[PDB]
mmCIF file of C-alpha atoms and ligand atoms in Angstrom:
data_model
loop_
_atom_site.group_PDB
_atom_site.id
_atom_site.type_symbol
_atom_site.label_atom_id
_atom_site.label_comp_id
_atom_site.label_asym_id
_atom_site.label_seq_id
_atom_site.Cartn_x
_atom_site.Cartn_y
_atom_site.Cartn_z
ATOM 1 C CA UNK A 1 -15.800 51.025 71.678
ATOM 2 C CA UNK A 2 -12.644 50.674 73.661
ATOM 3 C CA UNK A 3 -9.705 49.045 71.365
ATOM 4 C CA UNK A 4 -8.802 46.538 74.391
ATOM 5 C CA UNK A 5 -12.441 45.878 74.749
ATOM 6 C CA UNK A 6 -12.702 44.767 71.253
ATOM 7 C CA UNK A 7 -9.425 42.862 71.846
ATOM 8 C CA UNK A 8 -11.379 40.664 73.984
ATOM 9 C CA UNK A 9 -14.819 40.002 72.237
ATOM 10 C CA UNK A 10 -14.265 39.967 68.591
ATOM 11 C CA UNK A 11 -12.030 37.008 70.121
ATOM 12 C CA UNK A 12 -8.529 39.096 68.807
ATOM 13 C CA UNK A 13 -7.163 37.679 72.759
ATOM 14 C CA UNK A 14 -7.367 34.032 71.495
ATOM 15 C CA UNK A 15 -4.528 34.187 69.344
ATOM 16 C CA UNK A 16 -2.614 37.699 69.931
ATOM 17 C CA UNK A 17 -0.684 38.909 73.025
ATOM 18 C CA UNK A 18 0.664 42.392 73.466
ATOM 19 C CA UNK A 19 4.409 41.384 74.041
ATOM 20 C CA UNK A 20 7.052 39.326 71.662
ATOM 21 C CA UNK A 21 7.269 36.002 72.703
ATOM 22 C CA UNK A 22 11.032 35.777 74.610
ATOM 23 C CA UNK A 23 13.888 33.952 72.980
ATOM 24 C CA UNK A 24 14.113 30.014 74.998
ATOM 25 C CA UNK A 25 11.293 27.535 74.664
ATOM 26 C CA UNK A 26 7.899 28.101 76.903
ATOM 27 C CA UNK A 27 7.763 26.268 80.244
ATOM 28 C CA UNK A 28 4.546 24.323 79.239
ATOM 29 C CA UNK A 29 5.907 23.331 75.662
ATOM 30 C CA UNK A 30 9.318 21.595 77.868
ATOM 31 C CA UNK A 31 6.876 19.836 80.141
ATOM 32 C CA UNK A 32 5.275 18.188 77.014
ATOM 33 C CA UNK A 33 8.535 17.301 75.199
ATOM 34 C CA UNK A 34 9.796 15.460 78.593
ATOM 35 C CA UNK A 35 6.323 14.047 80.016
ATOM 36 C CA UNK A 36 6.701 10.312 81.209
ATOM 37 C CA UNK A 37 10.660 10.345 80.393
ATOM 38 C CA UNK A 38 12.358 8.622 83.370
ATOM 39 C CA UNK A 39 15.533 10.886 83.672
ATOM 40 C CA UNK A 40 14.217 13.767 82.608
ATOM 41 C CA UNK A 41 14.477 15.928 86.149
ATOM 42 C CA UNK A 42 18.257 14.927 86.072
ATOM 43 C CA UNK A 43 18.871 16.100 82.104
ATOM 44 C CA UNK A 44 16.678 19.327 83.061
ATOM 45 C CA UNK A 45 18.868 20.445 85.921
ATOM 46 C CA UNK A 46 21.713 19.919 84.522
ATOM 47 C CA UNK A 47 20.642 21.951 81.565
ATOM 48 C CA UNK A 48 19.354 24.519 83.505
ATOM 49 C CA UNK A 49 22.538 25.018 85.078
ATOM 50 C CA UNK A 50 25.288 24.196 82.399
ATOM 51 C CA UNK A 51 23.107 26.294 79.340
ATOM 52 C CA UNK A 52 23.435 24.482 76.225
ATOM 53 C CA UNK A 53 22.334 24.802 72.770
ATOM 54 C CA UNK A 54 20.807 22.728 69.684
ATOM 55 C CA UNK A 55 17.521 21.196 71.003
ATOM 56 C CA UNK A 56 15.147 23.860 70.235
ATOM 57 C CA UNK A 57 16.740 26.138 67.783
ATOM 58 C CA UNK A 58 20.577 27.106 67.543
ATOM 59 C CA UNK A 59 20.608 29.762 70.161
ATOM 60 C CA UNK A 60 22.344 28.832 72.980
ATOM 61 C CA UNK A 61 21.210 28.891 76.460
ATOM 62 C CA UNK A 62 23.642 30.505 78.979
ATOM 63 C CA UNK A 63 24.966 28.448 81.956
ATOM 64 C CA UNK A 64 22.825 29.893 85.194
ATOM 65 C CA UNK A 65 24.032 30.440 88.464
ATOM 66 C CA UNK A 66 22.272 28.269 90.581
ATOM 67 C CA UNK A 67 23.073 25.236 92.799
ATOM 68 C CA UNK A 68 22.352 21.921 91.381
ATOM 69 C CA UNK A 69 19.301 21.863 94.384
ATOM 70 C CA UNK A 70 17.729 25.029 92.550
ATOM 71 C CA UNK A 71 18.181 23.362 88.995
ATOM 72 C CA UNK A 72 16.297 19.908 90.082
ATOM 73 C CA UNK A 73 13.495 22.273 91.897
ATOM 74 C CA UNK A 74 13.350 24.438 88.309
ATOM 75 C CA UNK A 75 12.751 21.114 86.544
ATOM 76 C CA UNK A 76 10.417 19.659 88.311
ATOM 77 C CA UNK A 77 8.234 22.921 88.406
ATOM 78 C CA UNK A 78 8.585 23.491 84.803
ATOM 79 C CA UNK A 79 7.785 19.724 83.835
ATOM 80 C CA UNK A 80 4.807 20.203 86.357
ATOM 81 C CA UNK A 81 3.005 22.804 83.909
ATOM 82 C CA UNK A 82 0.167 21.429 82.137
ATOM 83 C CA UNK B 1 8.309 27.831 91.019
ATOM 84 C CA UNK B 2 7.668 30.396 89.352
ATOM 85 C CA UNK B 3 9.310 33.277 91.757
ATOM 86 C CA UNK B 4 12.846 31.245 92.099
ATOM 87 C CA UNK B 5 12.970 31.439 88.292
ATOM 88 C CA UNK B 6 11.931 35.327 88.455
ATOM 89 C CA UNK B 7 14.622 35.682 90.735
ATOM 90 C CA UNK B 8 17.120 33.888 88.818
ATOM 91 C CA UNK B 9 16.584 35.695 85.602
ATOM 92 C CA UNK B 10 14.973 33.002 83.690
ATOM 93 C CA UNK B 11 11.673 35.084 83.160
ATOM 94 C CA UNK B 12 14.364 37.155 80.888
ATOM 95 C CA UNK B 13 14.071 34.133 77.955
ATOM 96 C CA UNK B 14 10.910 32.208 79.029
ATOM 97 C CA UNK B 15 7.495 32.382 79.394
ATOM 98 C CA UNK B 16 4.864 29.304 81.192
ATOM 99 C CA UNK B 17 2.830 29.724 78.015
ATOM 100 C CA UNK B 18 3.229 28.823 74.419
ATOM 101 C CA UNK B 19 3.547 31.516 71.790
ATOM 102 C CA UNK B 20 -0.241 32.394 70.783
ATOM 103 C CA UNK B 21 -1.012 31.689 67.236
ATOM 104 C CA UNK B 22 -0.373 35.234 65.704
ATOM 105 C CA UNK B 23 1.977 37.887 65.890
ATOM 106 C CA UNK B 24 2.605 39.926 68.910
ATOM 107 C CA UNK B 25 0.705 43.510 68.783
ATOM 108 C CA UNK B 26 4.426 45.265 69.552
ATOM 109 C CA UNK B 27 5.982 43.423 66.735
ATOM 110 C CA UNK B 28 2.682 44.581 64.539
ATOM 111 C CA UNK B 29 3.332 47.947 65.557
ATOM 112 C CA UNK B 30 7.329 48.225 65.194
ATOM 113 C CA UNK B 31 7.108 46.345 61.274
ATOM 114 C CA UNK B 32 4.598 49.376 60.348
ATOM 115 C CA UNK B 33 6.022 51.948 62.328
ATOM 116 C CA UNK B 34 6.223 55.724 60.113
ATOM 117 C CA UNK B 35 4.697 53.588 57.299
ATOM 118 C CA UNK B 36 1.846 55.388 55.199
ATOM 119 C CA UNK B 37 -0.914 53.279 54.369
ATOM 120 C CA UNK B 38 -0.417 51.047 57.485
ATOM 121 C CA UNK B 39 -4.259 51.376 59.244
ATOM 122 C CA UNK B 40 -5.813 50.965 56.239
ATOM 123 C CA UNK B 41 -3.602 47.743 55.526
ATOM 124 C CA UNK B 42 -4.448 46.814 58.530
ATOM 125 C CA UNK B 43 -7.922 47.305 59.151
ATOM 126 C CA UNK B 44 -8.094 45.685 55.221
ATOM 127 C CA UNK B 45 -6.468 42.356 56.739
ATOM 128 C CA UNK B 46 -8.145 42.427 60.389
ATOM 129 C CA UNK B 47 -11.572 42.110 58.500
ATOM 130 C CA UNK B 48 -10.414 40.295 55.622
ATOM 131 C CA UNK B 49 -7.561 37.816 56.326
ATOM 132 C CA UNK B 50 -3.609 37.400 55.949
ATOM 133 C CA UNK B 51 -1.478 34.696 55.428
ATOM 134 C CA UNK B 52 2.191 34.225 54.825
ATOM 135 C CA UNK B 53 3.446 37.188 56.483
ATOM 136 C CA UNK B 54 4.006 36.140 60.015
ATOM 137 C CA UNK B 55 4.064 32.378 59.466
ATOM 138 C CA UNK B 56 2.138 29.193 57.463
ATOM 139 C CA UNK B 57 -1.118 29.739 59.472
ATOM 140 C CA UNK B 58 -3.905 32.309 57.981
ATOM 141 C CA UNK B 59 -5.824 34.307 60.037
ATOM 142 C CA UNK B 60 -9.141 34.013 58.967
ATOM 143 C CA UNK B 61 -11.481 37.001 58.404
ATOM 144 C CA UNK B 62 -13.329 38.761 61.225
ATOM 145 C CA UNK B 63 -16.680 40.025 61.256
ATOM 146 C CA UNK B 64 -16.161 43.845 62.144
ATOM 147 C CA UNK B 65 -17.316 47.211 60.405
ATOM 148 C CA UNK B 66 -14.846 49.126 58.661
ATOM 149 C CA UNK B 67 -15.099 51.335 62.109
ATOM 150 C CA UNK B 68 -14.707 48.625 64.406
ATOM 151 C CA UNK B 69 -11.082 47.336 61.818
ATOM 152 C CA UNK B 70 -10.026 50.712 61.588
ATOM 153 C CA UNK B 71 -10.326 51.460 65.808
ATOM 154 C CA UNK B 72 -8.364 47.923 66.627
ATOM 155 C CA UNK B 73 -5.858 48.541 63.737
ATOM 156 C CA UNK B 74 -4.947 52.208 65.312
ATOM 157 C CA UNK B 75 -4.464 50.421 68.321
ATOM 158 C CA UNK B 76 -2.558 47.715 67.499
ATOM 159 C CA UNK B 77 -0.407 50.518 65.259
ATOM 160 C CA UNK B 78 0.335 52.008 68.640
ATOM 161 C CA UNK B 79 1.210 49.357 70.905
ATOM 162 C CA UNK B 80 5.312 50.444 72.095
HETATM 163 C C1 HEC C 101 16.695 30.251 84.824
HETATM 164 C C2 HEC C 101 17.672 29.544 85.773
HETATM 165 C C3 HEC C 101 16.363 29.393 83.603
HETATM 166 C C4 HEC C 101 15.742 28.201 83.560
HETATM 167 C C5 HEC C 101 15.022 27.524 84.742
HETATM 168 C C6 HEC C 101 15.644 27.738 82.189
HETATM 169 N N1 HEC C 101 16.313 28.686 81.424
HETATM 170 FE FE1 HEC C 101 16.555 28.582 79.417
HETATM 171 N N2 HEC C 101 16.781 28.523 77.416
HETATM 172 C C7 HEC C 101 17.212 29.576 76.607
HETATM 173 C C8 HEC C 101 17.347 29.080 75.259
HETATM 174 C C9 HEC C 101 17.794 29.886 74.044
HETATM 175 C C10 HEC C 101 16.951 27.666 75.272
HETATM 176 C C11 HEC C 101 16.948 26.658 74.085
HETATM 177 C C12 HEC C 101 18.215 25.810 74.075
HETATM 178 C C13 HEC C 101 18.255 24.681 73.069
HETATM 179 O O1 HEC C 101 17.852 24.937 71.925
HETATM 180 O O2 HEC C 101 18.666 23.608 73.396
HETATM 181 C C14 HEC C 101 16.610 27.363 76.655
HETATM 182 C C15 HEC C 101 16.164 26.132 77.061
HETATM 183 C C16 HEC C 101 15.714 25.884 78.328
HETATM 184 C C17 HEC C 101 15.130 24.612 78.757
HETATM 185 C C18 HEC C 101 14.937 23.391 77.812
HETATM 186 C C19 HEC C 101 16.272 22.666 77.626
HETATM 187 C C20 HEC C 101 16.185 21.398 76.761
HETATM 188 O O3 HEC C 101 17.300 20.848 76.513
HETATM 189 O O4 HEC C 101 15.024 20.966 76.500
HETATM 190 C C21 HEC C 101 14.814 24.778 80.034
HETATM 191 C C22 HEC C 101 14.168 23.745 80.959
HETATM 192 C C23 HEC C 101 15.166 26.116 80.451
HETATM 193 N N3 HEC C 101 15.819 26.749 79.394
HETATM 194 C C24 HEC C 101 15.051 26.573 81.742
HETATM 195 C C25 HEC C 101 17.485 30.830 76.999
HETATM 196 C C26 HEC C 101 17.620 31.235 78.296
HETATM 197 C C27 HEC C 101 18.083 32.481 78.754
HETATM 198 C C28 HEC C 101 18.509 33.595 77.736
HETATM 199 C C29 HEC C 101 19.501 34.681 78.026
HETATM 200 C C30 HEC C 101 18.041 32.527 80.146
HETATM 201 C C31 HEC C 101 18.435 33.649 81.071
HETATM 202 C C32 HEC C 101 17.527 31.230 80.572
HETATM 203 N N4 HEC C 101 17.236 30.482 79.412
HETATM 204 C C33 HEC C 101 17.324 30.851 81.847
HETATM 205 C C34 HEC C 101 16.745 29.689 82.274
HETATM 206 C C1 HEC C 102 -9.678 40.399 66.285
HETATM 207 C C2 HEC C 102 -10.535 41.257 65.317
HETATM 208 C C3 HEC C 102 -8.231 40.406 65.671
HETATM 209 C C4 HEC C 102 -7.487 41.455 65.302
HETATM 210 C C5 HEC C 102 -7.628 42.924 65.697
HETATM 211 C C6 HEC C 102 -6.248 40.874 64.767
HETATM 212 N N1 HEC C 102 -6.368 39.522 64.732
HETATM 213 FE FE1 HEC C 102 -5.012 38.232 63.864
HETATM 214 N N2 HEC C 102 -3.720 37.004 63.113
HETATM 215 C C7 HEC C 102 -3.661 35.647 63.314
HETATM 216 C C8 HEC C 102 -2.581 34.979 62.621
HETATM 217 C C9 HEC C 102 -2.199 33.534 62.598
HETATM 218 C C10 HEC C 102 -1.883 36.071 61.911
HETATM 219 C C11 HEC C 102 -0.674 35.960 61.001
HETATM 220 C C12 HEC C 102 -1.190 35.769 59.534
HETATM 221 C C13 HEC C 102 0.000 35.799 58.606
HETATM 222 O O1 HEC C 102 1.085 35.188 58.945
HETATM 223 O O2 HEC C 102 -0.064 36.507 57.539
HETATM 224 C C14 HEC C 102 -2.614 37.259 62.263
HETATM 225 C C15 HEC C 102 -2.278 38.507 61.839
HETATM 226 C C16 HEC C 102 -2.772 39.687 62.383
HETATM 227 C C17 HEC C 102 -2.381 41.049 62.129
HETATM 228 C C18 HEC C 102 -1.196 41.434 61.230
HETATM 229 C C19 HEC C 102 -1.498 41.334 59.684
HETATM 230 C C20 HEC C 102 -0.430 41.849 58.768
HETATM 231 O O3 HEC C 102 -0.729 42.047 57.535
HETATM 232 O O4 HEC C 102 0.735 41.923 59.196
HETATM 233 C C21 HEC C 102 -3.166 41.878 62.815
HETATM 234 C C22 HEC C 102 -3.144 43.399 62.933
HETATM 235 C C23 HEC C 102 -4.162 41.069 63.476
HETATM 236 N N3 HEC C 102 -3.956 39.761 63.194
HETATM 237 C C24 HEC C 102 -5.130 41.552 64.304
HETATM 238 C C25 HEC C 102 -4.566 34.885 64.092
HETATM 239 C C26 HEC C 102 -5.726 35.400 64.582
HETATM 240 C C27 HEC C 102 -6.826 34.662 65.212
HETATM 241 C C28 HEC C 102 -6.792 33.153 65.376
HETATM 242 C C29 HEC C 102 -8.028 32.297 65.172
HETATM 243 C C30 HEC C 102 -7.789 35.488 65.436
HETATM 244 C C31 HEC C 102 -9.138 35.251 66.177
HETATM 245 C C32 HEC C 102 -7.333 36.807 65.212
HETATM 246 N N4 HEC C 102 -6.075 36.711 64.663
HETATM 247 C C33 HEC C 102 -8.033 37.922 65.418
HETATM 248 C C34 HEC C 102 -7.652 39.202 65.221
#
């Protein structure tokens, strides 16, 4: 059989992926840390744009170079993932 | 959405997903790379189990032929 056939039903896709998982926290695991919490569009987008570090690990996130517009829209997509 | 934060670079560091329970095939591949031994390790643990070398959570045995472990391990052994 084809290896990425087998990948799929021996059930090897459930729980492996072909790429490293990337260095800042995933977009759906930041929507569940902030779900319900009043202000947190406004601490988002202002982390989004200033970086920061601490929160998830002690890598720090760069500052970005977007408007403060751009960091509200980025936060209220990524809390939107479910 | 989700081509804003291509185009910013934020794809770069993050994915929409969670990391899947076990390791990433490339990282599989690099850790055994120009090691003897390594598909037979491999296929050993794909139908057997491992725990404790990628994290706290085993992976539990799978029901394959020694064929079947041996094809997926030479495939994961190549993944670049
Ligand atoms: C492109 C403009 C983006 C956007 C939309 C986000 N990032 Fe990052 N990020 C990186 C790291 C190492 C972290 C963890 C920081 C910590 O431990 O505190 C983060 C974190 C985030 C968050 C969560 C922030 C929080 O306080 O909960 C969010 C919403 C987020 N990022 C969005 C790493 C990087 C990068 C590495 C070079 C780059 C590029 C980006 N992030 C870019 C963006
Ligand atoms: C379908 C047959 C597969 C195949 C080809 C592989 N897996 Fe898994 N796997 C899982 C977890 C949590 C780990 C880490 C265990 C630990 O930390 O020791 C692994 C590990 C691997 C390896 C690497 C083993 C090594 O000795 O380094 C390889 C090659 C591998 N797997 C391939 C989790 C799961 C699953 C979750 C329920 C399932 C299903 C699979 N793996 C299935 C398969």
């Amino acid at each position: 059989e084809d290896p990425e056939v087998l990948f799929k039903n021996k059930g090897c896709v459930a729980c492996h992926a072909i790429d490293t998982k990337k260095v800042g926290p995933a977009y759906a695991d930041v929507a569940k840390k902030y779900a319900g919490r009043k202000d947190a569009v406004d601490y988002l987008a202002g982390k989004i744009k200033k970086g920061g570090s601490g929160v998830w690990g002690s890598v720090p996130a760069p500052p970005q170079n977007v408007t403060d517009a751009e960091a509200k829209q980025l936060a209220q997509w990524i809390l939107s993932i479910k | 959405n989700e081509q804003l934060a291509k185009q910013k670079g934020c794809m770069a560091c993050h994915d929409l997903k969670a990391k899947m329970v076990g390791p990433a095939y490339k990282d599989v591949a690099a850790k055994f790379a120009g090691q003897a031994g390594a598909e037979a390790e491999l296929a050993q643990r794909i139908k057997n189990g491992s725990q404790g070398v990628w994290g706290p959570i085993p992976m539990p045995p799978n029901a394959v032929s020694d064929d079947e472990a041996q094809t997926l391990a030479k495939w994961v052994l190549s993944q670049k």
